Coordinates of C-alpha atoms in Angstrom, one line a residue:
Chain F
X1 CA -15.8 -42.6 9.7
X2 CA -19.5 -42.6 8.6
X3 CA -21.5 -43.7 11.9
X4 CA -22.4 -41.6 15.0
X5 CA -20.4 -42.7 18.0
X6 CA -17.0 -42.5 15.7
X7 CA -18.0 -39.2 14.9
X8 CA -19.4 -38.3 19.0
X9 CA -15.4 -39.9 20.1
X10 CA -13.7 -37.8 17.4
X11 CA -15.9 -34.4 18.2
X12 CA -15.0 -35.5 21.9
X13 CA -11.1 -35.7 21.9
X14 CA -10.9 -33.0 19.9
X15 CA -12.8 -30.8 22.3
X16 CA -9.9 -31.8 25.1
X17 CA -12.5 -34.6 26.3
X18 CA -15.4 -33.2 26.8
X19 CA -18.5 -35.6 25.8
X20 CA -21.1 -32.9 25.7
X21 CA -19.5 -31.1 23.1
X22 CA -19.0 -34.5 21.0
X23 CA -22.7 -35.6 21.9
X24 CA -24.0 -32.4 20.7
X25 CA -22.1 -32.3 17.9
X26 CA -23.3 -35.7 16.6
X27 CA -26.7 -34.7 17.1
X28 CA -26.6 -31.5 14.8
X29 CA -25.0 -32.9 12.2
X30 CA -26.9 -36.3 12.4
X31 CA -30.5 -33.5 12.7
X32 CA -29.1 -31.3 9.8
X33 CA -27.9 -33.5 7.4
X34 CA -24.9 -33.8 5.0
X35 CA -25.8 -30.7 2.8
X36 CA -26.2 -28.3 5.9
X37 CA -24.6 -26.1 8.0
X38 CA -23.4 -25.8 11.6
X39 CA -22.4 -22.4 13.4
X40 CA -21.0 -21.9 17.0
X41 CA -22.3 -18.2 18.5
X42 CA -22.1 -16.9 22.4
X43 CA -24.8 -18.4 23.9
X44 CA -26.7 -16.4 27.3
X45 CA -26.8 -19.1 30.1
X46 CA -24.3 -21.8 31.8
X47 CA -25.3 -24.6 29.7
X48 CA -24.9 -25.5 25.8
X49 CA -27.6 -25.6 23.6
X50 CA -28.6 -27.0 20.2
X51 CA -31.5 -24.6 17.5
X52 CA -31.9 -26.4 14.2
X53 CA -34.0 -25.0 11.5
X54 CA -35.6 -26.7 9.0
X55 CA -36.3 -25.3 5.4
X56 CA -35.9 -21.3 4.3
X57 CA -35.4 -18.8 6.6
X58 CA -33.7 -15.5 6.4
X59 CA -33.3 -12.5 8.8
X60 CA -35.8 -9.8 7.6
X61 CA -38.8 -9.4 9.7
X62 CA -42.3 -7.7 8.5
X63 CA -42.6 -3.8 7.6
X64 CA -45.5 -3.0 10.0
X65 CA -46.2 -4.1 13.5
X66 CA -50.2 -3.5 12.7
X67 CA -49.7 -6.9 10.6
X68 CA -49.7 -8.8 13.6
X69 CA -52.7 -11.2 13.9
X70 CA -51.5 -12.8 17.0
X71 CA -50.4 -10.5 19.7
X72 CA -49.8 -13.1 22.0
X73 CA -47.0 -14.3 20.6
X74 CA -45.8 -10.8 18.5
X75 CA -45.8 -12.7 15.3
X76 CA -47.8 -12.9 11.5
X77 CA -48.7 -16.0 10.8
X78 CA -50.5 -16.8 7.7
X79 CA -52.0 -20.3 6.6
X80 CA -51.1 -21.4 2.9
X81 CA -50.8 -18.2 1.7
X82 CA -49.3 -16.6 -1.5
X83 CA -46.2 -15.2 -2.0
X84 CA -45.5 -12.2 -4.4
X85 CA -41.8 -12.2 -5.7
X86 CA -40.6 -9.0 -6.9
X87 CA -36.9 -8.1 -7.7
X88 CA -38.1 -3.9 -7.7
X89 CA -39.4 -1.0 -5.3
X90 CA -42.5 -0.7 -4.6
X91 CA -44.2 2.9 -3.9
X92 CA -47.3 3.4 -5.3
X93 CA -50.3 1.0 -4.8
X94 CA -51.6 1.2 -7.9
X95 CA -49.2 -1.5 -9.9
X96 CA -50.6 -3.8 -6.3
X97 CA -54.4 -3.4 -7.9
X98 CA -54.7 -6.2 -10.0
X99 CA -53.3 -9.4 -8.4
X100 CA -54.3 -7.7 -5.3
X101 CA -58.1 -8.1 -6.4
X102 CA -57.6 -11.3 -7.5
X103 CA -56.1 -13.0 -4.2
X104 CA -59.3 -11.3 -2.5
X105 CA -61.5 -13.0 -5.0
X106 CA -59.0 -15.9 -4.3
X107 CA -59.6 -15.3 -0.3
X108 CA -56.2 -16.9 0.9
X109 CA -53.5 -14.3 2.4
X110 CA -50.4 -12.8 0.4
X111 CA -46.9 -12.4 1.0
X112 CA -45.0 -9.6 -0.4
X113 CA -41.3 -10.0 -0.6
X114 CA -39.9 -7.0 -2.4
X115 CA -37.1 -4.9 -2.0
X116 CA -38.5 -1.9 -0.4
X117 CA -42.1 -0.8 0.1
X118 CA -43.0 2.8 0.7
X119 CA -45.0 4.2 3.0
X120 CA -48.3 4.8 1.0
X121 CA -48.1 1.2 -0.2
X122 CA -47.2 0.6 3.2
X123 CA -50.6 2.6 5.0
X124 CA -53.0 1.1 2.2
X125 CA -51.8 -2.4 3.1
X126 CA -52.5 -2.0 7.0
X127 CA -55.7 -0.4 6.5
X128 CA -56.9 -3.2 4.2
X129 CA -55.8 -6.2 6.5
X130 CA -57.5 -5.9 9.5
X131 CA -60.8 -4.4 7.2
X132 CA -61.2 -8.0 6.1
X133 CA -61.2 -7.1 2.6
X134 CA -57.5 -9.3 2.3
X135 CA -54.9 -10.9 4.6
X136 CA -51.6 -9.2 3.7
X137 CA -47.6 -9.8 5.1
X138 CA -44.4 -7.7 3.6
X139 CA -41.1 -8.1 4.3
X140 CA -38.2 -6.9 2.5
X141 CA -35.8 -9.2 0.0
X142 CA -32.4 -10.7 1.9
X143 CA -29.8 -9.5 0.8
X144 CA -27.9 -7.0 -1.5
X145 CA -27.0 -7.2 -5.0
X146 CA -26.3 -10.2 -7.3
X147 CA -26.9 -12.5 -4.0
X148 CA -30.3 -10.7 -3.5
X149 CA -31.5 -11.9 -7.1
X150 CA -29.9 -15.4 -6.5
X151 CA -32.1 -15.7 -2.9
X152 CA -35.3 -14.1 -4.8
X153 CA -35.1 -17.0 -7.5
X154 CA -34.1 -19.8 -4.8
X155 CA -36.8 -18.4 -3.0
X156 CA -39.2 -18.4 -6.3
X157 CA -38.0 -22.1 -7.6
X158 CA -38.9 -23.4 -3.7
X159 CA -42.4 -21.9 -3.6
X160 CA -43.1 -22.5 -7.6
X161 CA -43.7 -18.6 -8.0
X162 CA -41.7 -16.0 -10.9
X163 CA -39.7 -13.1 -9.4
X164 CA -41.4 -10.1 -11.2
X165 CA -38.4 -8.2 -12.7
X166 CA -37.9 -5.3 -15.3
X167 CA -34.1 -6.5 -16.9
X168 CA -35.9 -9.9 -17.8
X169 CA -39.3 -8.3 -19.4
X170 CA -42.3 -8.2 -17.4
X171 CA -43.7 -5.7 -15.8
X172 CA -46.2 -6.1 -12.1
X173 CA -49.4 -5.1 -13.4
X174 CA -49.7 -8.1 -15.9
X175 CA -49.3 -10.7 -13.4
X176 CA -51.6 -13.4 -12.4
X177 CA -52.1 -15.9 -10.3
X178 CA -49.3 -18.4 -11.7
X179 CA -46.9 -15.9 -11.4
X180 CA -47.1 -16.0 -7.5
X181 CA -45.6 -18.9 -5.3
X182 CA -47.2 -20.8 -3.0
X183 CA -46.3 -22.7 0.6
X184 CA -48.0 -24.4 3.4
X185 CA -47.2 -21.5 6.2
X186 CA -45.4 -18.4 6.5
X187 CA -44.1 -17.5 10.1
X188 CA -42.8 -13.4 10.3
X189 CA -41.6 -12.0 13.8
X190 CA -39.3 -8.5 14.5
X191 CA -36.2 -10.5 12.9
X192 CA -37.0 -13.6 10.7
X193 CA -39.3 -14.9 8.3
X194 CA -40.0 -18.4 7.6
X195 CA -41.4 -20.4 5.1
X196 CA -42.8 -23.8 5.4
X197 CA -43.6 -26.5 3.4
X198 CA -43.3 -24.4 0.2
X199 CA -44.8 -26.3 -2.7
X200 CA -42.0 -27.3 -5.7
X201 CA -41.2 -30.1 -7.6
X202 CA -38.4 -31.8 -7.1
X203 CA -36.6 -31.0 -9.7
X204 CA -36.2 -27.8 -10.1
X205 CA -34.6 -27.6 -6.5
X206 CA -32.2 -31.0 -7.3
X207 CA -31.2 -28.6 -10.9
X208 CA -30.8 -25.4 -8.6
X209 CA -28.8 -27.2 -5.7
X210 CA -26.2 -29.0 -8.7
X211 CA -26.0 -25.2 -10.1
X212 CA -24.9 -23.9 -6.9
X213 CA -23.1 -26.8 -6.4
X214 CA -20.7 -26.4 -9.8
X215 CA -20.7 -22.6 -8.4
X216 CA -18.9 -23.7 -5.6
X217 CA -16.3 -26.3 -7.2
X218 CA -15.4 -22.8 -9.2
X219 CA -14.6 -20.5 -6.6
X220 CA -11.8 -19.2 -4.7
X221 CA -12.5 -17.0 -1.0
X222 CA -13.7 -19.4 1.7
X223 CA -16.3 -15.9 2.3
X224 CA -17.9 -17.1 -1.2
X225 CA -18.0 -20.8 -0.3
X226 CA -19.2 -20.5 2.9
X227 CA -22.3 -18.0 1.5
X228 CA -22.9 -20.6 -1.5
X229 CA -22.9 -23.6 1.4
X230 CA -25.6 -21.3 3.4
X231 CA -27.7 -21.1 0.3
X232 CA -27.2 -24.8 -0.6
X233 CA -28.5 -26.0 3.0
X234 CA -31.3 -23.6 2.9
X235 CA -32.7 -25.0 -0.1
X236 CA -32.2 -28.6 0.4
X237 CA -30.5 -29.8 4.7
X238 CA -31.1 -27.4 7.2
X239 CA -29.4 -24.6 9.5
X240 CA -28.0 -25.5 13.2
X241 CA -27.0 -23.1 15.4
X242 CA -25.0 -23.9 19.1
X243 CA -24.7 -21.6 22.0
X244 CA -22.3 -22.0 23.9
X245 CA -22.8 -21.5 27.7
X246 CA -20.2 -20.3 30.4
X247 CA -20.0 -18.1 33.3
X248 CA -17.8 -15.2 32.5
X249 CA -15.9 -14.1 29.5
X250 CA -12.5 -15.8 29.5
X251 CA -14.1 -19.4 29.9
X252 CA -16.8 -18.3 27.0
X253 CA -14.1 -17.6 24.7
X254 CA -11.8 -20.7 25.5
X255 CA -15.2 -23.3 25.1
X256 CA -15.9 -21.6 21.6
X257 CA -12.6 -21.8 20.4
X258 CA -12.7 -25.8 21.6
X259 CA -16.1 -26.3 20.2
X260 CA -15.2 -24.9 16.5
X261 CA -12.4 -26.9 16.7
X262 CA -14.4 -30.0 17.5
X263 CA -16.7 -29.0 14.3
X264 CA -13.9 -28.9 12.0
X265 CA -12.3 -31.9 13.1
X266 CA -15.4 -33.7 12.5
X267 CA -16.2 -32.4 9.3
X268 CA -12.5 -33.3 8.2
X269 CA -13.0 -36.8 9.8
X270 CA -16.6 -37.1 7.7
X271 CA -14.8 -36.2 4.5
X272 CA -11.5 -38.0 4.8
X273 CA -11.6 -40.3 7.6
X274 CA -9.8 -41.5 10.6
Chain Y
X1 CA -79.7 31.7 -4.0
X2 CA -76.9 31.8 -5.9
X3 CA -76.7 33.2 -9.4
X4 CA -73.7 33.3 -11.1
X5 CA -72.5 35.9 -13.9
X6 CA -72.2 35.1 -17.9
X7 CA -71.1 32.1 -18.5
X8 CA -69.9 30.7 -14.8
X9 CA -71.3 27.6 -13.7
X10 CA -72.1 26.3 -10.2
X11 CA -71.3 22.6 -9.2
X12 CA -70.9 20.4 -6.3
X13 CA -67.9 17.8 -6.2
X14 CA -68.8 14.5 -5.8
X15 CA -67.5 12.3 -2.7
X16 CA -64.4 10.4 -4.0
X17 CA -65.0 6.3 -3.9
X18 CA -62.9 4.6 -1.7
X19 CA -63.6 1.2 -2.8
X20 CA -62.1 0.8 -6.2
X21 CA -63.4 -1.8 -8.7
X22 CA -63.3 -4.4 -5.6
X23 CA -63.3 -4.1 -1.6
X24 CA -59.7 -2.9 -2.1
X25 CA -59.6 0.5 0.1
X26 CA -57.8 3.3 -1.0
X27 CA -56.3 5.6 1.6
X28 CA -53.4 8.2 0.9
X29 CA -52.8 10.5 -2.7
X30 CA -54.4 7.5 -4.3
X31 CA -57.3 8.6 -4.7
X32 CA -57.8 11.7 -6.1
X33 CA -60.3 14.7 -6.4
X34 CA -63.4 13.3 -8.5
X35 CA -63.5 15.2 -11.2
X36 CA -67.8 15.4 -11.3
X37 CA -70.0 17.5 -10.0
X38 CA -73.8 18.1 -9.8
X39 CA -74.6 21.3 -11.5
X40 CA -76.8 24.1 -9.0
X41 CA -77.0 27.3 -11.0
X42 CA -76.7 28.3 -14.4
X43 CA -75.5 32.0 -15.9
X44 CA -77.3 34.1 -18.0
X45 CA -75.3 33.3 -20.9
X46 CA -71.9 34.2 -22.8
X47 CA -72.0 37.5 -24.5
X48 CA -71.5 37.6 -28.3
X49 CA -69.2 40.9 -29.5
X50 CA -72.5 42.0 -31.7
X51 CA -74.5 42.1 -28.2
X52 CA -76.7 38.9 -28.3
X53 CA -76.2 36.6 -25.8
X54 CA -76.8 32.8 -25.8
X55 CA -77.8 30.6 -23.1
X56 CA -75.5 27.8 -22.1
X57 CA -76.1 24.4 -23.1
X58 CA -75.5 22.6 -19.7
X59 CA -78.6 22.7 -17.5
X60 CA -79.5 22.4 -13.8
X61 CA -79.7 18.5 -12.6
X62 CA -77.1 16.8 -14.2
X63 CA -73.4 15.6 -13.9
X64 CA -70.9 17.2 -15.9
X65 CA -66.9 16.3 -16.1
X66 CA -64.7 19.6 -15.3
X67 CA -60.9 20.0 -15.6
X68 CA -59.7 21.7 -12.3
X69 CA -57.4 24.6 -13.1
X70 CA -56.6 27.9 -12.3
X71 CA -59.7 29.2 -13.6
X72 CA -61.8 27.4 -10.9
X73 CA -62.3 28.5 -7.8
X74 CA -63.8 27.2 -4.6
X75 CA -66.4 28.9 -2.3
X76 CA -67.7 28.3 1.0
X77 CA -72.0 28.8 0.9
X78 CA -74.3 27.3 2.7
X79 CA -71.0 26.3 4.9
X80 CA -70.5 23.7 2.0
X81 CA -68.3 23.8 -0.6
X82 CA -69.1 24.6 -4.1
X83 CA -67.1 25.0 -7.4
X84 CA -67.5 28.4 -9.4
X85 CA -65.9 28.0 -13.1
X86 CA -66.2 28.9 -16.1
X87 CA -68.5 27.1 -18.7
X88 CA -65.6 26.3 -20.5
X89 CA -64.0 24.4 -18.0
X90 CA -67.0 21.9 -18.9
X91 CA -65.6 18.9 -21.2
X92 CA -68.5 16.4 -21.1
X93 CA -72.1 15.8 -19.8
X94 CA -72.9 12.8 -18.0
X95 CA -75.8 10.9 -19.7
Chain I
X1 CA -73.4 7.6 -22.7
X2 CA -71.3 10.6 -22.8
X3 CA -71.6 13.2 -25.4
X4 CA -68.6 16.2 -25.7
X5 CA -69.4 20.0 -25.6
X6 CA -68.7 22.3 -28.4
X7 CA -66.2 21.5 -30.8
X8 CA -64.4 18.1 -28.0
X9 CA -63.8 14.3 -28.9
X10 CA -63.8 11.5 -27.1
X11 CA -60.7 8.5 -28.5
X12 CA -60.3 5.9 -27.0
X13 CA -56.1 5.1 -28.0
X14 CA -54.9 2.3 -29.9
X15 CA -52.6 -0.4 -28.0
X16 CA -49.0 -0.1 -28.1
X17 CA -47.4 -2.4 -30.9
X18 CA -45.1 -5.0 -29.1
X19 CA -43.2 -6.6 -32.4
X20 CA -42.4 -3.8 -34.7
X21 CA -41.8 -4.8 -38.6
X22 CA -40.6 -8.0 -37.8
X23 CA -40.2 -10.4 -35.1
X24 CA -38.2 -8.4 -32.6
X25 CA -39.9 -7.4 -29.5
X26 CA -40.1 -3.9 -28.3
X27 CA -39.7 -3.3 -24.6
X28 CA -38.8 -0.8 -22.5
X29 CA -39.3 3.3 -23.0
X30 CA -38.9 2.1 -26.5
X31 CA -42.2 1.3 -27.1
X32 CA -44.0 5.0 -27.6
X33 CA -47.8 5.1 -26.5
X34 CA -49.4 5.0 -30.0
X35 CA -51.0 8.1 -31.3
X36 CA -54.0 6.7 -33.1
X37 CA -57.5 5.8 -31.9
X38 CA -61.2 5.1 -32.4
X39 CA -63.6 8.0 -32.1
X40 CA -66.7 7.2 -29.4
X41 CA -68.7 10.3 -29.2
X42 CA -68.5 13.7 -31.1
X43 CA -69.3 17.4 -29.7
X44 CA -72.1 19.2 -31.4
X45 CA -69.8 21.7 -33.0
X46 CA -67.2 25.0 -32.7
X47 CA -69.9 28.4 -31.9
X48 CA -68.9 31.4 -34.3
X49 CA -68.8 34.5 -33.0
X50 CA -72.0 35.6 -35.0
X51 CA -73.8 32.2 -32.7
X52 CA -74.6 29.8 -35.4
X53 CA -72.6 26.1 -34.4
X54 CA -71.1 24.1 -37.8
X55 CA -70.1 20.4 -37.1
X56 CA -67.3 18.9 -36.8
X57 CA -65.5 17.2 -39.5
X58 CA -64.6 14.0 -37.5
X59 CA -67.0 11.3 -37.6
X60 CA -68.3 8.5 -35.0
X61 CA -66.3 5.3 -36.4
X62 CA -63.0 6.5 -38.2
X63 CA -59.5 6.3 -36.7
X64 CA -57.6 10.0 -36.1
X65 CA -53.7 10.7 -35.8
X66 CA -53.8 13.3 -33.0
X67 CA -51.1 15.3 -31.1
X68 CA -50.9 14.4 -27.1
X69 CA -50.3 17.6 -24.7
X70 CA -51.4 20.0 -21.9
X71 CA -55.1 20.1 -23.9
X72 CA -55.8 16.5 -24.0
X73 CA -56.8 15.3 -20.7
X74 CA -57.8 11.3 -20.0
X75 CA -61.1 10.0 -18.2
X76 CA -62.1 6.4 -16.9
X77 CA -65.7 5.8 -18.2
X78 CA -67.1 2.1 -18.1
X79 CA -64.0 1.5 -16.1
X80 CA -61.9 2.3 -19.4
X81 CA -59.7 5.0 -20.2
X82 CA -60.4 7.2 -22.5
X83 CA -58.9 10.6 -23.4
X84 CA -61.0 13.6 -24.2
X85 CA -59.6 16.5 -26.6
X86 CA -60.3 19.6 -28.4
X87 CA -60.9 18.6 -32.2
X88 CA -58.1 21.4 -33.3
X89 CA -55.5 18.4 -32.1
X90 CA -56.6 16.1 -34.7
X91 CA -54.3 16.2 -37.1
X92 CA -55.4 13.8 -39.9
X93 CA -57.9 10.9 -40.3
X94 CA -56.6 7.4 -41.8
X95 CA -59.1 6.0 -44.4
Chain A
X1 CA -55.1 6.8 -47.4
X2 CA -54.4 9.6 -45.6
X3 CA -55.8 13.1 -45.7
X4 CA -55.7 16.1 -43.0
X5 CA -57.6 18.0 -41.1
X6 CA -58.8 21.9 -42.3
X7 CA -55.5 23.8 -43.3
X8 CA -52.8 21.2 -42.3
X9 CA -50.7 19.7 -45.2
X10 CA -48.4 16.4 -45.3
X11 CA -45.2 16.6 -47.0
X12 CA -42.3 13.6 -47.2
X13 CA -39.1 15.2 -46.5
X14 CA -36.4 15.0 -48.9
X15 CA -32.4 13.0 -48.5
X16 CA -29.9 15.6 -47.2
X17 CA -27.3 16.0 -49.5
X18 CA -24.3 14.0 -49.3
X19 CA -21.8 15.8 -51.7
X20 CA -22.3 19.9 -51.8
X21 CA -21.4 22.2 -54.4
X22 CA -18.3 19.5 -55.4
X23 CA -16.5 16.1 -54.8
X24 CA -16.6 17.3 -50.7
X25 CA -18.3 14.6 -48.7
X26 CA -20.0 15.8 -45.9
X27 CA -20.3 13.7 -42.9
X28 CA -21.2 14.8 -39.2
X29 CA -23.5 17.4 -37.6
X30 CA -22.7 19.6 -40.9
X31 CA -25.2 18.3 -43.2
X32 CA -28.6 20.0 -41.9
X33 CA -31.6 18.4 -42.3
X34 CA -32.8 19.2 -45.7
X35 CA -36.0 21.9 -45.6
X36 CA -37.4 20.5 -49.2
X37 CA -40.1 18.2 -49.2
X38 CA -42.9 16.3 -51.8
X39 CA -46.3 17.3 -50.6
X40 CA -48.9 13.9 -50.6
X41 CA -52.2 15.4 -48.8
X42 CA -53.8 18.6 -48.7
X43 CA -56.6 19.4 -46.3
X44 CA -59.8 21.0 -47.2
X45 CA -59.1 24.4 -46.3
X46 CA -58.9 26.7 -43.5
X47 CA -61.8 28.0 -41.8
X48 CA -62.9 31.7 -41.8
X49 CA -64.6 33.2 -38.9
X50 CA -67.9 33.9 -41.2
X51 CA -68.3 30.3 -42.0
X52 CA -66.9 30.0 -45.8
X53 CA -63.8 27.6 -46.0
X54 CA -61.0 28.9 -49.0
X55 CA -59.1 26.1 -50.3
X56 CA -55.3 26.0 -49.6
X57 CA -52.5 27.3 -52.3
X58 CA -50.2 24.5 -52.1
X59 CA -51.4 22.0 -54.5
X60 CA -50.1 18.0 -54.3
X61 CA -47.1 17.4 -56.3
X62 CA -45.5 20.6 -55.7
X63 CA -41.7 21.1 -54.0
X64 CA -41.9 23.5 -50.7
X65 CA -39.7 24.7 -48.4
X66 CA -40.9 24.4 -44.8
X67 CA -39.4 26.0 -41.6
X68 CA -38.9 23.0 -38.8
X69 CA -40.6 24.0 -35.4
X70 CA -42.6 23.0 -32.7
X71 CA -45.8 23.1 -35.0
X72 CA -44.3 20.7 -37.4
X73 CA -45.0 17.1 -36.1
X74 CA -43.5 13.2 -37.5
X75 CA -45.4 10.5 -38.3
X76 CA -44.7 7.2 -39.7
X77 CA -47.2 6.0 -42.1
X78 CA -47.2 3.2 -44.8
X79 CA -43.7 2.7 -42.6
X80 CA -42.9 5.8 -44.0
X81 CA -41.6 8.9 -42.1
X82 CA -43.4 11.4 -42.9
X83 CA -44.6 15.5 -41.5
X84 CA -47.5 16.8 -40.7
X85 CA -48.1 20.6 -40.3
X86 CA -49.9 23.8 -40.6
X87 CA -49.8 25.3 -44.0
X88 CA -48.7 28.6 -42.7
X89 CA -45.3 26.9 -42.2
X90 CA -45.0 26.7 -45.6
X91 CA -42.8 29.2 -46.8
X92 CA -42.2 29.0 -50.8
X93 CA -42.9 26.4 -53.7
X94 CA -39.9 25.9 -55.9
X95 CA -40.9 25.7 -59.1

């Protein structure tokens, strides 16, 4: 079962017959790829519809409303900029000095993806961006834990950048321009930030993707498998999301349960057949 | 005028930079109290146990490096501020 | 140019050794900020209570071993750090 | 080569004992640093208020015993440890 109508009839009798659902379901998977992965959440109207995402994207938005440079939409949007990868707190500006000058000799923006950023760091920031002086983002890192590192360095193999850490022996001060990533365009709003077009070599992101991928052929919860898939897609297919749409409560509950049974009946038929 | 007694010294602080070593702005603790000062009056001089007294070796005009302490205090003349330590305070003499 | 009052030096501290008598790198807290520098500039000398000044014994070139604390304080000139101290915390001078 | 500063004098400190007064090994917090040391370098001598300087009376090569403070202060030289303190912390010379 490898072409798209098999997969449309099989997505479509396991829905109870519904087409839509099938149709729909075809088109995700045939937009997201083999490596991706589909989700089913409430949706708000009476109709079903279909958000794919392409490349990285997690759900942390930027630290500061004053970063905004586009009000009309609400959101930071910075044009090849850099991005500044470290696995620590940030609280005091003056470890920020140095590569700080040197991407405003540089004269591109910056992205700071750290942990946490204090509040001084925080006002010196804002009251350098709009000054002109340098075009600066921050967000905080996705997250907690072990899974936080292993998104930093996913994050930091995508772009081509080093996560600055202190339990692998470098410190922030003595970093320089090849230490910091680089991509094509950063989008930040209240919620998400994305990163597009992030400059890599292939690779590194084929080596990272067979890592995860031996990760996965050695673990046990479906929980772990399912993160490792998300993590998997997000580095090389990309993220769908359908909505379902229904009028009241009871029906909304009885199409979700059909459509996740559609999904997994096509995945099983991709894998295995018909 | 103000003249200060034996060996206390008169300064004005210096306006603390904001840029630092680039157009980066620093706004917050960051940037802390300048520790120069142009000098304004002089004392007579410290007072030996014998009873001679010898003049101090900073003079009026130029910019001296203080450490702030307990043994400086600040005074409101001229309705500006001004510094009254001691000449020992004094650690170095700019140029 | 900045010249020290009285009987205070101006060092300038040695980096901080990374591999330490042999191959195997030193990071961390490990790694104590070294205690031996290169004197810049020299005060004129201690005053005795009689008034006349003697020189200090410390010398414009040679490297000291000196003892950090509350008395030595540290000072960016030429954009450089460099840490100003009584002479009574050097402790020995190598070669 | 090292040499100190006015009054201050380097000694190497000697092993603590492993076997006291018998066969008894000692191991643990028992065995107190040792308070015997080799003097290397003398310094010139300590400074009187008229101006004369009076050479010290510990003279290199002699055995002291030294009591451990705050004024008494490591250094590792020649990868060597060795302590550098005032002379007045000197307390006797065996011998």
């Amino acid at each position: 079962c490898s072409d798209s109508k098999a997969i449309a009839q099989v997505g479509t009798i396991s829905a109870n017959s519904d087409e839509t659902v099938g149709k729909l379901i075809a088109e995700a998977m045939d937009k997201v790829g083999k490596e991706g992965v589909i989700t089913v959440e409430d949706g708000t109207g009476l109709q079903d519809e279909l958000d794919v995402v392409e490349g990285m994207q997690f759900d942390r938005g930027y630290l500061s409303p004053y970063f905004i440079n586009k009000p009309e939409t609400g959101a930071v949007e910075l044009e090849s900029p850099f991005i500044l990868l470290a696995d620590k707190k940030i609280s005091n500006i003056r470890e920020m000095l140095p590569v700080l000058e040197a991407v405003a000799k540089a004269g591109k923006p910056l992205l700071i993806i750290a942990e946490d950023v204090e509040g001084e760091a925080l006002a010196t920031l804002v009251v350098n961006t709009m000054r002109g002086i340098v075009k600066v983002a921050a967000v905080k890192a996705p997250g907690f834990g072990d899974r936080r590192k292993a998104m930093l360095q996913d994050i930091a193999t995508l772009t081509g950048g080093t996560v600055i850490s202190e339990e692998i022996g470098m410190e922030l001060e003595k970093a320089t321009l090849e230490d910091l990533g680089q991509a094509k365009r950063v989008v930040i709003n209240k919620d998400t930030t994305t990163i597009i077009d992030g400059v890599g070599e292939e690779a590194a992101i084929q080596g990272r993707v067979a890592q995860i991928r031996q990760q996965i052929e050695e673990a046990t919860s479906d929980y772990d498998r399912e993160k490792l898939q998300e993590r998997v897609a997000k580095l090389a297919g990309g993220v769908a999301v359908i909505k379902v749409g229904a009028a009241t409560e009871v029906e909304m509950k009885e199409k979700k349960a059909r459509v996740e049974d559609a999904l997994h009946a096509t995945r099983a038929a991709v894998e295995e057949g018909v | 005028n103000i003249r200060p007694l034996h060996d206390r010294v008169i300064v004005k602080r210096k306006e603390v930079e904001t840029k630092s070593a680039g157009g980066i702005v620093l706004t917050g603790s960051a940037a802390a109290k300048s520790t120069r000062g142009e000098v304004l009056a002089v004392g007579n001089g410290r007072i030996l146990e014998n009873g001679e007294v010898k003049p101090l070796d900073v003079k009026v005009g130029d910019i001296v490096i203080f450490n702030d302490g307990y043994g400086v205090k600040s005074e409101k003349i001229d309705n500006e501020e001004v510094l009254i330590m001691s000449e020992s305070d004094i650690l170095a003499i700019v140029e």
